[PDB]
Amino acid sequence: GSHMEDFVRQCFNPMIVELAEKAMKEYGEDPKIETNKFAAICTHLEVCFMYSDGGSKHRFEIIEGRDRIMAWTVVNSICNTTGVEKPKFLPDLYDYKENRFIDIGVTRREVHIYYLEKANKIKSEKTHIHIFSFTGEEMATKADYTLDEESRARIKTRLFTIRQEMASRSLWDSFRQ
Ligand SMILES: *S(=O)(=O)OC[C@H]1O[C@@H](n2ccc(N)nc2=O)[C@H](O)[C@@H]1OP(=O)(O)OC[C@H]1O[C@@H](n2cnc3c(N)ncnc32)[C@H](O)[C@@H]1O
């Protein structure tokens, strides 16, 4: 029974927590053991939902937060109706305005380290990458940030608030691992 686990459950909304638990069990991981991974997964989910809230009404197809099988079905429907090429790793959204997948990442290192890692890893050239850090930095493919500045600013503010809440509990150092 860890502090981090109880922190996560009071820090994130129950819908987010439930999705994160589902996602971990589906990969055979235990939220009560891998408590830093639990916190990171909830964080990534909340950022993706906040990001999809920034678009105009029908701008995005949300991929993240679905069962893995259904998430790939929807990806397949998108590729088959748009011609866009199928990503090799599951992206988080599809942008119907810019006609591209978005892979969103949240990092405790300099943004460009994780940006570069994701770039090399998906190697699916056309997929848009957008990284946020817990210190207010962001980095996106082609310097095209997709959303208006306010919708990105509120994501940065929420991430620093998560960081402060962990630090106030002496949990930030082992999370930033
Ligand atoms: S998410 O898309 O918001 O990702 C959040 C964190 O998960 C890491 N990640 C993502 C995808 C894949 N395939 N692997 C993966 O490791 C990602 O790097 C994000 O972590 P941070 O960049 O904030 O770093 C946190 C600490 O975790 C350790 N770490 C991360 N990645 C590592 C790899 N590949 N090898 C070894 N250790 C790794 C570091 O201690 C890091 O400071």
UniProtKB/TrEMBL annotation:
Q: Which residues bind Mn(2+) 2?
A: E64, D92
- Coiled-coil spans in chain: none
**Binding site residues for Mn(2+) 1:** D92, D103, I104
Q: Please state what the protein is called.
A: Polymerase PA
